[PDB]
Amino acid sequence: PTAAHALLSRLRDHGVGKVFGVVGREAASILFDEVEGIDFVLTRHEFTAGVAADVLARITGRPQACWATLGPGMTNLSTGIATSVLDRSPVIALAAQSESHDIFPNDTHQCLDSVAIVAPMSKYAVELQRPHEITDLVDSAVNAAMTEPVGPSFISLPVDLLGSSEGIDTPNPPANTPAKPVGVVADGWQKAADQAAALLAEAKHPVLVVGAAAIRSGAVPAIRALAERLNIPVITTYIAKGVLPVGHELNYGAVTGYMDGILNFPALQTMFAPVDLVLTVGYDYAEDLRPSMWQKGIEKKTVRISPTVNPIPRVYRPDVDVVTDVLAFVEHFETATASFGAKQRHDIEPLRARIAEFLADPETYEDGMRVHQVIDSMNTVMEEAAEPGEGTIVSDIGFFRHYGVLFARADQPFGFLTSAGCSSFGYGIPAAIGAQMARPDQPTFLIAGDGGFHSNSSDLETIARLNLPIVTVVVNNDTNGLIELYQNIGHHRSHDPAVKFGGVDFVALAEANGVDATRATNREELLAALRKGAELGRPFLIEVPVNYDFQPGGFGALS
Amino acid sequence: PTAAHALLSRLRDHGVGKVFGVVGREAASILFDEVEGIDFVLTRHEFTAGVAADVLARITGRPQACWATLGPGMTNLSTGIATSVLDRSPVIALAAQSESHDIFPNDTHQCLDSVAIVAPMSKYAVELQRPHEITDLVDSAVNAAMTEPVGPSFISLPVDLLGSSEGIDTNPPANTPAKPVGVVADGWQKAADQAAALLAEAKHPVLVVGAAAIRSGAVPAIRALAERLNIPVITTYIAKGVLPVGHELNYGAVTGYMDGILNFPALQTMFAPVDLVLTVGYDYAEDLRPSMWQKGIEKKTVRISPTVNPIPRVYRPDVDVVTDVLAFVEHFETATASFGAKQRHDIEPLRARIAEFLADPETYEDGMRVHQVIDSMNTVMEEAAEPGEGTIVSDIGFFRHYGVLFARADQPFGFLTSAGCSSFGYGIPAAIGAQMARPDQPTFLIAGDGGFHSNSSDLETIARLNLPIVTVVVNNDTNGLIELYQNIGHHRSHDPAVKFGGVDFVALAEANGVDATRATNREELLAALRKGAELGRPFLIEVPVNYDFQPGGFGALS
Amino acid sequence: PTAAHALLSRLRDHGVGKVFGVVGREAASILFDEVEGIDFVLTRHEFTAGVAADVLARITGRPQACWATLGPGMTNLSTGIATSVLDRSPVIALAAQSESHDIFPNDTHQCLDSVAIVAPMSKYAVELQRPHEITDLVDSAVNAAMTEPVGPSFISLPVDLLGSSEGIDPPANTPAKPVGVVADGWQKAADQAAALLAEAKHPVLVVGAAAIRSGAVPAIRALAERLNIPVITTYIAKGVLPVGHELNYGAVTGYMDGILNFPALQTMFAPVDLVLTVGYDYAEDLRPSMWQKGIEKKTVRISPTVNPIPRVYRPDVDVVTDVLAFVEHFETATASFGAKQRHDIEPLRARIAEFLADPETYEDGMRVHQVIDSMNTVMEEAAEPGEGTIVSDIGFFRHYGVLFARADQPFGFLTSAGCSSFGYGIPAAIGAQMARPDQPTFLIAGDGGFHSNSSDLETIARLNLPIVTVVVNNDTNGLIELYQNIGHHRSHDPAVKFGGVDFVALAEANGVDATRATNREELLAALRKGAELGRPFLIEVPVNYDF
Numbered sequence A: 001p002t003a004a005h006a007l008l009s010r011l012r013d014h015g016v017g018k019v020f021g022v023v024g025r026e027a028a029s030i031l032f033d034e035v036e037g038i039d040f041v042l043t044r045h046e047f048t049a050g051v052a053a054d055v056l057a058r059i060t061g062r063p064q065a066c067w068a069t070l071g072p073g074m075t076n077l078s079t080g081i082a083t084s085v086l087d088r089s090p091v092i093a094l095a096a097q098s099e100s101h102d103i104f105p106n107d108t109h110q111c112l113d114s115v116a117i118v119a120p121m122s123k124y125a126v127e128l129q130r131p132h133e134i135t136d137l138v139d140s141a142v143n144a145a146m147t148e149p150v151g152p153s154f155i156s157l158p159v160d161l162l163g164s165s166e167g168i169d170t171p172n173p174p175a176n177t178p179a180k181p182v183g184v185v186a187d188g189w190q191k192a193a194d195q196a197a198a199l200l201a202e203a204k205h206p207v208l209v210v211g212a213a214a215i216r217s218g219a220v221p222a223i224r225a226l227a228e229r230l231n232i233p234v235i236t237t238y239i240a241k242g243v244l245p246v247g248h249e250l251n252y253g254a255v256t257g258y259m260d261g262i263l264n265f266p267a268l269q270t271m272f273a274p275v276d277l278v279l280t281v282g283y284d285y286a287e288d289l290r291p292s293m294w295q296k297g298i299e300k301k302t303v304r305i306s307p308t309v310n311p312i313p314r315v316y317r318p319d320v321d322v323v324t325d326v327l328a329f330v331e332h333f334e335t336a337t338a339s340f341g342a343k344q345r346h347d348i349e350p351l352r353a354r355i356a357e358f359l360a361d362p363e364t365y366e367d368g369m370r371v372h373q374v375i376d377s378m379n380t381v382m383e384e385a386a387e388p389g390e391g392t393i394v395s396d397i398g399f400f401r402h403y404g405v406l407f408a409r410a411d412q413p414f415g416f417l418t419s420a421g422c423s424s425f426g427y428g429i430p431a432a433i434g435a436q437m438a439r440p441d442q443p444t445f446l447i448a449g450d451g452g453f454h455s456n457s458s459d460l461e462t463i464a465r466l467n468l469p470i471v472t473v474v475v476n477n478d479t480n481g482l483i484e485l486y487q488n489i490g491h492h493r494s495h496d497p498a499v500k501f502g503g504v505d506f507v508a509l510a511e512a513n514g515v516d517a518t519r520a521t522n523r524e525e526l527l528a529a530l531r532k533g534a535e536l537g538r539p540f541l542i543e544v545p546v547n548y549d550f551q552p553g554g555f556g557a558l559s
Numbered sequence B: 001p002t003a004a005h006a007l008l009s010r011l012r013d014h015g016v017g018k019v020f021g022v023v024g025r026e027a028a029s030i031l032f033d034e035v036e037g038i039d040f041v042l043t044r045h046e047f048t049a050g051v052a053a054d055v056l057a058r059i060t061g062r063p064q065a066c067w068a069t070l071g072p073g074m075t076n077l078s079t080g081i082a083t084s085v086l087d088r089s090p091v092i093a094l095a096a097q098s099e100s101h102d103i104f105p106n107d108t109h110q111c112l113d114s115v116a117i118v119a120p121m122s123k124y125a126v127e128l129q130r131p132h133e134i135t136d137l138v139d140s141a142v143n144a145a146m147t148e149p150v151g152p153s154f155i156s157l158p159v160d161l162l163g164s165s166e167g168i169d170t171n172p173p174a175n176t177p178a179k180p181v182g183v184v185a186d187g188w189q190k191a192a193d194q195a196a197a198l199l200a201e202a203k204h205p206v207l208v209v210g211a212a213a214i215r216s217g218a219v220p221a222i223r224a225l226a227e228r229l230n231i232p233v234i235t236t237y238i239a240k241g242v243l244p245v246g247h248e249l250n251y252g253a254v255t256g257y258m259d260g261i262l263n264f265p266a267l268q269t270m271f272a273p274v275d276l277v278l279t280v281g282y283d284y285a286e287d288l289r290p291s292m293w294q295k296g297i298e299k300k301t302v303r304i305s306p307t308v309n310p311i312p313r314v315y316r317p318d319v320d321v322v323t324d325v326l327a328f329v330e331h332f333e334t335a336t337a338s339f340g341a342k343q344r345h346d347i348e349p350l351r352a353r354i355a356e357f358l359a360d361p362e363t364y365e366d367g368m369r370v371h372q373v374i375d376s377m378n379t380v381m382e383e384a385a386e387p388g389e390g391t392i393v394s395d396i397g398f399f400r401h402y403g404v405l406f407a408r409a410d411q412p413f414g415f416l417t418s419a420g421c422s423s424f425g426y427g428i429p430a431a432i433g434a435q436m437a438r439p440d441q442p443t444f445l446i447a448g449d450g451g452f453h454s455n456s457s458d459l460e461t462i463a464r465l466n467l468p469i470v471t472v473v474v475n476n477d478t479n480g481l482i483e484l485y486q487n488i489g490h491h492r493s494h495d496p497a498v499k500f501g502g503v504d505f506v507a508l509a510e511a512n513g514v515d516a517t518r519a520t521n522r523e524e525l526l527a528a529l530r531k532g533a534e535l536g537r538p539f540l541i542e543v544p545v546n547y548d549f550q551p552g553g554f555g556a557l558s
Numbered sequence C: 001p002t003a004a005h006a007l008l009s010r011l012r013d014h015g016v017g018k019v020f021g022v023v024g025r026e027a028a029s030i031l032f033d034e035v036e037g038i039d040f041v042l043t044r045h046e047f048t049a050g051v052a053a054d055v056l057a058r059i060t061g062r063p064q065a066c067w068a069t070l071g072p073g074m075t076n077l078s079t080g081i082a083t084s085v086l087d088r089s090p091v092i093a094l095a096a097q098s099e100s101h102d103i104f105p106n107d108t109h110q111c112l113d114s115v116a117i118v119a120p121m122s123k124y125a126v127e128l129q130r131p132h133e134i135t136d137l138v139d140s141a142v143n144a145a146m147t148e149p150v151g152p153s154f155i156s157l158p159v160d161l162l163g164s165s166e167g168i169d170p171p172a173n174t175p176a177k178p179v180g181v182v183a184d185g186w187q188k189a190a191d192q193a194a195a196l197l198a199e200a201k202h203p204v205l206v207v208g209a210a211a212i213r214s215g216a217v218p219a220i221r222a223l224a225e226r227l228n229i230p231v232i233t234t235y236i237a238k239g240v241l242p243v244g245h246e247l248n249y250g251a252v253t254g255y256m257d258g259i260l261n262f263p264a265l266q267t268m269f270a271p272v273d274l275v276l277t278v279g280y281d282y283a284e285d286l287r288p289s290m291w292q293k294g295i296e297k298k299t300v301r302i303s304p305t306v307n308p309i310p311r312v313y314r315p316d317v318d319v320v321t322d323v324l325a326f327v328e329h330f331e332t333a334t335a336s337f338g339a340k341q342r343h344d345i346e347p348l349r350a351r352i353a354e355f356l357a358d359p360e361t362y363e364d365g366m367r368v369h370q371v372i373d374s375m376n377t378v379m380e381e382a383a384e385p386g387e388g389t390i391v392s393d394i395g396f397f398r399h400y401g402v403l404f405a406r407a408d409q410p411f412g413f414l415t416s417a418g419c420s421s422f423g424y425g426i427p428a429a430i431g432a433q434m435a436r437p438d439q440p441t442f443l444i445a446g447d448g449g450f451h452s453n454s455s456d457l458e459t460i461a462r463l464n465l466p467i468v469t470v471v472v473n474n475d476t477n478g479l480i481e482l483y484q485n486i487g488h489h490r491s492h493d494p495a496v497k498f499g500g501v502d503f504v505a506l507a508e509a510n511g512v513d514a515t516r517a518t519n520r521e522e523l524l525a526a527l528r529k530g531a532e533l534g535r536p537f538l539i540e541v542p543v544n545y546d547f
């Protein structure tokens, strides 16, 4: 009864039921059957394992776990660890290491200085030295992972120590996992919140800009109730979509720096020009809604609310900075504004009409479909297949992703799922795996571009094996299209050797992996393929040829 | 004319004609057409890009370059960087970073502390700060990369500075070292004479030769030394082919897994009578460990390396000669010019056991056995290659150690695998690099389903570049190496940690534009290999296999 | 028989006979009497311990050792470590750490992440994990310390493991001289340097201390004498030619034009057309800008390291090899060359001599050039030919030592060129006197620097090291006042000015006899008393600089 047993058992104490990963020769020390109620989920690549854990942790609000072997195992995991540190999720990342007496980084076969590599991109990073201490290392890893900004904690596990029973006996202390993320709280935040209330009192057109930290705090119902009483519009980051339902009159949509260029419309101005008070609730620069994006039209006052001290005063200097738990802020603000009546909200109907126009685009194009037409089709079928307030649309990374930000249906928090902080291509499949395991009876659709999807396409077999009924739409233009855009923004022309691929038949690719698939080249075929996939009881993949036809000049907000 | 131009131009000065990578939004600052003579090679994943650079650098003996975007680009590239630091290749690894004024690691979108992440696994790691200095940073990167132990140097490139012309005017000589700079101890010549004196007394010496001997340019000189004094040559995985196939002093490669695979006391046969082991160009990372040769009688040891011994806890040679390998061999020639040839010891029982595995004529109900697959590969490689030419590449897994024992190598680096780092998925990028380095030679890859599928998407890259690689995927629907270790440790398996569902690799290959076929016996496999070798296009062959391993014969792994 | 025994025992195998340091609560695990032939040398501060070891390693050319307790012991040691890494000396630095099971940096009492703190300023840094491995950890430390650029290796020692015998029941092979790097084709680069030399009318050899570590002083001297090539040195390589030798063109410093009221640097370098930097190291602070005077020069870099600073120094010919090996191949390649006409620096020489002989009496105090003249006179009297050490602490006065101090042997003049920590004086004199027990050892220090580390006067008295110290006092961090004036054209006293310290009474409080000297006559007599006293002695001299 070894450190391997004590490790899995302590993970189970913190509520962990799955370990995502790829196991190496450390399997001599750990099988993964040692503890009832915790199972191993084998992936094709360690990135997929880390991102699956990240997303399961985001949707559940609880710590999750991923696993890799020594050396290149750990370095592959590290992109998943980077996803978690920048996207903010409490992940316990575990990696094997060389036998303790044989740790000579860059000399022993497969031996890297794992702690030194992973420490700069994690909340906590340690190597096991005495087998019985694994219990307390796991606890400290959870403690640091579950403190804002939430993130991954790493434990390196020399194979000899992982397989040792030295000092291990028969009743663990309580796990004491934080109920929700620990935050920091400045003395005098209540006063700062009252100053925010006094700004709201004077303001003609305030807005709430809501990031994911608001969701982790459990502040969604409270924020909605506050907004509905005071008639304050709710604008969001990418993953804060769905904090209000689709169709809510205060659902002013999400922001992306790409939106003016994609829509050939003054969308940022429409969204922010008349606003005189911006309250960034649970603000986090990593999400990439930046101050320059709301600095439109008239001069604005700002209120930052966050469970962290401002890490970026060079960029964001709020007029009022409220460092506290988001829910505690909202509850205090309700009391302070109880007597306040409702504002006249500003008018964004021209932007709404432009968005609706893209979604309804009836044209047929000689090349393939347009991405907005694809997402409108996905929206229609997700609305049919999901219960109200349920379902998940997942997006990999690419130019198409920002169409997702604008156009994708989200009818609950994290109803639209993508990587905002880290944005690694290939994110789509592991995110859909995590989303579907987190919401076992909800429809899970994934949209991915050809570039990113193929960077991590091999985990189609994992989807097949776990029989996760994800429907995947691959929008294919034989290009890293986002990068072709940036070539043109910077140089006013392309260079194909850096962005162009030859042909990949993703339908056939999927089928090689045991996932049924089909090609769709217009709305009618796409709606049929989506409806079939949604009802199939099995994974399904749809390849859709697309093109973009972008205006390189329309993207100045990206600087 | 920006720092992007000065960067590429300076790589060109050091002989670089290709940059492997995946480009991100730093494409706004760099196109990759700024310098004639340097082409970008786009891959599907950054790992492939790093490994291809690593292998190209190994075979050419010249610095090569790879490229990633910020954040997850860099971390993806980092497994390729780890490949180069542990396998020892001079790679200049380049990655974009957030705009200089906006670098807030873990707060700014996609911004990680790249230098801090990469420093521990590199020879040199720096962030560009003033555009015109990129020239001297590339120089410092090459310098550190080409000092033993050779390895990757890393430069982080803020997007704004990469695109800036500030301080750049319109170059000093490159001075690229033709071979790695080495460490040399005072008194190494005296240590080399003590080695000569041990050789005089020894009855059955061997030369155990690592890759560092190849880098030094010492292959012909070791061969002439060994032939004169009748000293057997035993190699690490990638020093296979320092002697030709069939050479009588070619005593084969070592792997820790050889006794278990052969079900034979192979290490004992190789080493028991030996009284003097000279480890020429020794490197522990290659995983030919002292415990492997410490069989039978007590032996004296001579370490020769262009580095100070980093592992005295494990290896305390009786004589340690810290110098360049070729310089050692030329002095040692002089010191031993008058010695009589040795009576070399017998390993024929081991040779016969290996030949017997290669000639295994059984048909199994399962699929094929891996030793039969490699036998078929050797046969066809010998037909298609000029003498002294051809490359067989191996990915990582249980089958890889069969490659070590069984795969044909008729030149230095004629059998390529990752000895130090051993990341699965290595095969495709290594075959790409090998084929670009030897454009007119046959390049064959063998990979297992586990590792092949970990990085199978760069099949599209092979098609796009039209590199006529022939790939054999040996498929048992398992991370078999790992099931073996489950059985060594626990005396049973646990499927959820090692088992996959079915993948059709033939169809997978064809989805990427690579022709392919299934082969289930020697006849079908020989025909598929001959078709692939004459095709003038890439080709893939899937072969069902099984292993049926004996966990009790792998004690040497501990 | 514990890991403490095994640690001391392995230091002993590598030739170490002294451990300089300050012991903390780890005394429970190590006494320092476990192994015969190793003595502990207790200092008042850890800095003094580190630097003493650095200097003893420099002179002996063998690895030396220093010791501190955990936490702030280790951080105090780190300035000594920094000295060793920038000045280049093979030092094994050892510090205790919290018990292994209680290592929680920044939470456990006195626990810092020692390895993370010291790794960036060392050749090697590790924490002991298994008691019996201390033997191999010491070997790897020595190995890394004795590879160019030579430097400190650090081992962190959790006190429970240090005092444990678990697992504790091979030749040391200590390198006799530093291991270095050698580039393929260096012989060919050396021949290109030979061809540059044939074409050159006025070559010079700029010699750094790495040339001394290679054992190349006699060979460089013979080369220089045969081809009539002047030799200029760094701060640390004064004495590679004897005092008086016609090719001993001296050391340079950036302040030498200012000190002499003379275009000294232009006189030294203006007509030179080939500079061979023999054993070059940027850390010795002879930068390319110092020789880039007058005509364009070709340059030859010779060093057993690959060039770390191509941004600053791009030699025309870069010879990466052992310095002695370069010199022997260069002898062969230049065997039949005619000797050069060497360029005239006699006006500079005559100026310097006029400076040193300055007979004026000043109202304020003495001038530092007069203090060094006096020290030179008495050193030449008290020392055998080719012997004696003058040590200099850091400050404005230090540049006077570089320019004018007598050095009749390699390391005959000591100072910190790389790190240049004030307080370096006392420890460097301790190390020098222990390295040369029968040779006279003089120290010159300024009031700012000397007082930063003056408590180790008690160590000098306890060890009865007959060091003669001269403290030049102007109640100021004078160099810093100079920098205020260079940048702002005025002083700001709160950042540079001290009140009075009576260094005579300070020395005597520490059990060191002392006296004040206010002119040449009093200083000569005081120096002669100190030199013959057979005990340490200190002399305070009032000085002023007046810029």
Ligand SMILES: Cc1ncc(C[n+]2csc(CCOP(=O)(O)OP(=O)(O)O)c2C)c(N)n1
Residues within 6 Å of the ligand: A396, A397, A398, A399, A400, A401, A423, A424, A425, A448, A449, A450, A451, A452, A453, A477, A479, A480, A481, A482, A483, B022, B023, B024, B025, B069, B072, B073, B076
């Ligand atoms: C790991 C990683 N490397 C590189 C990038 C730069 N990048 C972002 S998305 C992307 C893929 C873009 O292509 P695609 O998935 O086809 O979407 P498209 O832009 O064509 O719409 C790339 C290469 C990245 N995001 N992540």
Ligand SMILES: Cc1ncc(C[n+]2csc(CCOP(=O)(O)OP(=O)(O)O)c2C)c(N)n1
Residues within 6 Å of the ligand: A022, A023, A024, A025, A069, A072, A073, A076, B395, B396, B397, B398, B399, B400, B422, B423, B424, B447, B448, B449, B450, B451, B452, B476, B478, B479, B480, B481, B482
């Ligand atoms: C990046 C990485 N993760 C995990 C491992 C552990 N490992 C080594 S080889 C390998 C693949 C084994 O399966 P396969 O390629 O099918 O060969 P087999 O052992 O079945 O013969 C794995 C998972 C690894 N080598 N590299």
Ligand SMILES: Cc1ncc(C[n+]2csc(CCOP(=O)(O)OP(=O)(O)O)c2C)c(N)n1
Residues within 6 Å of the ligand: C394, C395, C396, C397, C398, C420, C421, C422, C445, C446, C447, C448, C449, C450, C472, C474, C476, C477, C478, C479, C480
């Ligand atoms: C540890 C350290 N802190 C600060 C300095 C800056 N500094 C260099 S020398 C020096 C002392 C100058 O005063 P003094 O020793 O009296 O010599 P002076 O310059 O007056 O001639 C100081 C403060 C330093 N060298 N080292």
Ligand SMILES: [Mg+2]
Residues within 6 Å of the ligand: A398, A449, A450, A451, A475, A476, A477, A478, A479, A480, A481
């Ligand atoms: Mg695309």
Ligand SMILES: [Mg+2]
Residues within 6 Å of the ligand: B397, B448, B449, B450, B474, B475, B476, B477, B478, B479, B480
């Ligand atoms: Mg397999």
Ligand SMILES: [Mg+2]
Residues within 6 Å of the ligand: C395, C446, C447, C448, C472, C473, C474, C475, C476, C477, C478
């Ligand atoms: Mg002073």
